[PDB]
Amino acid sequence: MNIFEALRIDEGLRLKIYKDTEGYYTIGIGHLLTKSPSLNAAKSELDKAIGRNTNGVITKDEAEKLFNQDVDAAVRGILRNAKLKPVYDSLDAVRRAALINMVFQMGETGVAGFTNSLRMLQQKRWDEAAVNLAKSRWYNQTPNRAKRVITTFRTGTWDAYKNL
Ligand SMILES: [Cl-]
Ligand SMILES: [Cl-]
Structure with missing residues (x-):
């Protein structure tokens, strides 16, 4: 994955x-x-x-090309963001992918707004961050997707995506 x-x-x-x-x-x-x-x-x-x-x-190819651009831009948005970069640098590869997913979905600005969660992630306080991430409009509006990203942050594995 x-x-x-x-x-x-x-x-x-x-x-x-x-x-x-x-x-x-x-x-x-x-x-x-x-x-x-x-x-x-x-x-x-x-x-x-x-x-x-x-x-x-x-076409399918066109969709894929837009997708590649979009992923690339999310990564770059992270690296350029003063609040995001440090978190991203502190994380393992799997968790980095969860952060990218969030940025892709909501934009750099939106994610940079999760101040408290970000601090927790940086401190490697997994369960606590998960709880905090859940107290958001994001989780309430798209709960199944949010749960997949949150579990990814919590466990550092791709388990939530294995089956789908
Ligand atoms: Cl574009
Ligand atoms: Cl959902």
């Missing part, structure tokens, strides 16, 4: 524009197009992202 495989399980893959859990226009493997309520604006962002007139549909 790895970050790519994990996120592919968590986000799924859809080749036509769809609405995510928050009602935002998205495509591929969790690639957010826009927070605007307009499908046209979404179609526009889509064409600009792929480089062609898509008409709201992309």
